[PDB]
């Protein structure tokens, strides 16, 4: 069985600093090259990683991590509690402009430090000694060992980071990592090579020696390379199949199709006219024919989304039907008319220019062209399209330099709030819409203190209801992962949240 794995990651990562990464491309790499206090096992549950033992206080708020004996970076240096402390505080430092700082707000003092209302010293992550990390949360958080497996909670080599502020931007002596693989090459916009890391504590269970990740943003070509034997995988999570090929691949029985905790949505910049008008947002959302899109455009067995939280998330199964009606043109026309009245306008032709944006990808263009048609036919609303390379695109949305913007969101841990708290705060890193609601916030925060699971769930549903009512985003569909593979590739870890770990993968 061969020991090299050839896959497409489509495009240049946003960042291979674990504290700046906020995307599937970045995460696809880092998830191979770093390891947190915990990692995800085959059954999608957290288990011990860099921490050999985890202790939680009686009150549930204080976690004490014992750092495994002998764990090392890829240059041989020990991994220490200090490395974690530094990483986490680095991500929270507002100067470093992590879009995922809010992911660390579960730690006491984290939000204050990040917002400028408090000292980084008072963030309650503490390297007590080299082998002991002590963490105090604002509230008992039963998924915290999921968060510590998430890439924002990765350690970085403190010594090298302090020496070279740009360590993360190139492969080389200054790029070191603690995961089952290490990155031995990175040609920007070309590819990345990972190799088994001989310093990783659990290296005896790692079978691959090399992973070549190419950067082909062309779905057709990915499948050709796969059909030629030059890739061992074609499609998601890291690549993509061309939509016209899914008929065939379903018919020959090769295609894998899996529902995942993820949502495809069109984000509105609620601070840019005319998307600042809630009525216009609703008219654009309600006038969508999502069943058409998932049957006729994407053809990947996606489920129409009329909600934020995927119905895989237990307690939220009835988001299958969602908060409103799909292809509800009557209601959309009502909203349009109301919003038109508020502007002193009679006809939708006289709205200001609207540009709908997405990241370069034939699949996203096909969806955008369908939606553009829906708006023209159903509302009389003209929109012009544009596309950008992924990493630039992420900054375009984060900086609100857009009106409507395609985005997709996969769960970072198995809790419904991951689909909600990204909109808690106006300048949240992953919000992008400029929206916030006081009641929405209050309920989110109340959910984090509620000890009964069903009552908590109701708070989140309430919150979701307010969200959908103000429509800062337009839900389109809940995700699937579709791919074909060399069926000799065994042991790949793919949890319901739609990521992939190659740590224990092999060819038989």
């Amino acid at each position: 069985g061969k020991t090299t794995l050839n896959i497409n990651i489509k495009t240049e990562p946003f960042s291979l600093h674990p504290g700046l990464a906020n995307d599937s491309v970045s995460g696809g790499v880092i998830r191979q090259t770093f390891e947190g206090l915990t990692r995800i096992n085959a059954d999608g549950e957290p288990e011990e990683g860099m921490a050999s033992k985890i202790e939680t206080s009686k009150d549930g708020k204080t976690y004490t991590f014992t750092i495994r004996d002998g764990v090392k970076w890829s240059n041989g240096d020990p991994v220490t509690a200090q490395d974690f402390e530094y990483a986490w505080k680095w991500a929270l430092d507002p100067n470093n402009e992590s879009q995922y700082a809010y992911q660390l707000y579960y730690i006491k003092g984290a939000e204050a430090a990040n917002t400028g209302k408090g000292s980084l010293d008072d963030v309650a992550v503490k390297a007590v000694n080299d082998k002991t990390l002590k963490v105090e949360l604002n509230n008992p958080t039963p998924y915290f060992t999921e968060l510590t497996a998430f890439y924002t909670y990765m350690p970085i080599n403190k010594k090298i980071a302090e020496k070279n502020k740009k360590w993360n931007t190139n492969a080389g002596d200054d790029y070191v990592s603690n995961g089952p693989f290490k990155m031995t090459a990175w040609k920007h916009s070309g590819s990345i090579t990972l190799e088994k890391n001989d310093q990783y504590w659990d290296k005896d269970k790692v079978k691959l020696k090399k992973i070549d990740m190419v950067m082909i943003n062309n779905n057709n070509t990915e499948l050709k390379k796969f059909q030629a034997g030059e890739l061992d995988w074609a499609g998601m999570p890291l690549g993509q199949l061309p939509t016209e090929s899914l008929p065939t691949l379903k018919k020959d029985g090769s295609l894998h199709v899996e529902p995942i905790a993820g949502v495809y949505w069109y984000k509105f910049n609620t601070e840019a006219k005319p998307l600042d008008n809630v009525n216009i947002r609703k008219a654009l959302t309600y006038s969508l024919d999502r069943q058409s899109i998932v049957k006729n455009v994407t053809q990947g067995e996606q489920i129409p989304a009329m909600a934020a939280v995927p119905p895989t998330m237990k307690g939220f199964e009835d988001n299958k039907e969602g908060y409103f009606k799909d292809n509800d043109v009557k209601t959309a026309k009502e909203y349009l008319e109301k919003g038109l009245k508020e502007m002193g306008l009679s006809k939708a032709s006289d709205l200001p220019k609207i540009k709908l944006s997405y990241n370069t990808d034939d699949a996203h263009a096909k969806i955008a062209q369908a939606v553009q048609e829906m708006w023209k036919k159903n509302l009389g609303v003209d929109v012009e399209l544009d596309n950008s390379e992924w990493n630039v695109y992420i900054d375009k949305l984060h900086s609100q330099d857009y009106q409507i913007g395609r985005m997709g969101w996969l769960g970072d841990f198995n809790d419904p709030i991951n689909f909600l708290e990204l909109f808690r705060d106006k300048n949240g890193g992953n919000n992008d819409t400029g929206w916030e609601n006081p009641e929405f916030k209050k309920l989110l925060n109340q959910s984090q203190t509620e000890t009964d699971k069903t009552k908590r769930a109701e708070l989140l549903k309430k919150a979701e209801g307010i969200f959908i009512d103000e429509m800062p985003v337009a839900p389109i569909y809940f995700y699937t992962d579709t791919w074909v593979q060399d069926e000799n590739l065994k042991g790949v870890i793919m949890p319901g949240t739609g990521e992939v770990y190659f740590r224990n993968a092999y060819f038989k």
């Binding site: 489509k10 995307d23 993820g262 992420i394 997709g408 996969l410």
Partner: peptide, 5 residues
């Protein structure tokens, strides 16, 4: 996380 696909 933001999904490219």
């Amino acid at each position: 996380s933001r999904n490219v696909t």
